[PDB]
Design a protein around this motif. Sequence first.
Motif, short mmCIF file in Angstrom:
data_model
loop_
_atom_site.label_atom_id
_atom_site.label_comp_id
_atom_site.label_asym_id
_atom_site.label_seq_id
_atom_site.Cartn_x
_atom_site.Cartn_y
_atom_site.Cartn_z
N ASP A 1 -19.29 -20.44 43.02
CA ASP A 1 -19.35 -21.90 43.06
C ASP A 1 -18.19 -22.41 43.92
O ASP A 1 -17.09 -21.87 43.86
CB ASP A 1 -19.28 -22.47 41.65
CG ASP A 1 -20.01 -21.62 40.63
OD1 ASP A 1 -21.22 -21.83 40.43
OD2 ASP A 1 -19.36 -20.73 40.03
N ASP A 2 -18.44 -23.47 44.69
CA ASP A 2 -17.42 -24.09 45.55
C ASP A 2 -16.64 -23.12 46.45
O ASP A 2 -15.43 -22.95 46.27
CB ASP A 2 -16.43 -24.91 44.72
CG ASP A 2 -17.10 -26.01 43.92
OD1 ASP A 2 -18.00 -26.68 44.47
OD2 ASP A 2 -16.74 -26.20 42.74
N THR B 1 -18.72 -15.35 40.25
CA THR B 1 -19.63 -16.39 40.71
C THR B 1 -18.98 -17.14 41.85
O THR B 1 -17.77 -17.36 41.82
CB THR B 1 -19.97 -17.36 39.57
OG1 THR B 1 -19.02 -18.43 39.55
CG2 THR B 1 -19.96 -16.63 38.23
N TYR C 1 -16.33 -8.90 41.05
CA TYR C 1 -17.59 -9.52 40.67
C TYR C 1 -17.29 -10.90 40.13
O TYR C 1 -16.51 -11.04 39.19
CB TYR C 1 -18.24 -8.70 39.57
CG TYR C 1 -19.70 -8.98 39.33
CD1 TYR C 1 -20.59 -9.09 40.39
CD2 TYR C 1 -20.19 -9.08 38.04
CE1 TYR C 1 -21.94 -9.31 40.16
CE2 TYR C 1 -21.54 -9.30 37.80
CZ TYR C 1 -22.40 -9.42 38.86
OH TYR C 1 -23.74 -9.64 38.62
#
Lengths: 50, 49, 50
Positions: free
Chosen positions: C45-46, C43, C41
């Motif tokens: 981003d990029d 995030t 789990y």
Amino acid sequence: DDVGIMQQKKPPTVVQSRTDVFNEQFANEALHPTTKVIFNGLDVNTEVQP
Amino acid sequence: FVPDVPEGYVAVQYAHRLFSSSLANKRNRVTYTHPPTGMAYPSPTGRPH
Amino acid sequence: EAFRWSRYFLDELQLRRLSVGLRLITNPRIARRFNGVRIMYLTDDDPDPD
């Protein structure tokens, strides 16, 4: 202490269905107790033992 | 029942000054700057307790 | 002399091309069947596939 027999009332059971990728957002999340559950087919204990 | 606040937490008064727009990996995320450390965290994930 | 080895019952040109084929069939670039996944789990981003 005794095991219940009549069908008990339960919290509503929201089914999160997490995939490879997803945009989690938490607007209008419920404040009442709730059952997060990830899979759909969780009635898996079918084979009854008399 | 009132859950007790856990040992590691830092008390912080809410204020409009804490929250702001910011660049973070090509998105205008709602960064929160922790008043003690001063550090900015764009993501809701990973912020200090 | 022709009986000493079957040569898998293939023509000499077939075996010669076959060695080149074996070079082709082990090139890392072709090996795009991937084994195993990490679930975590996190995030995204990029993003980068690597």
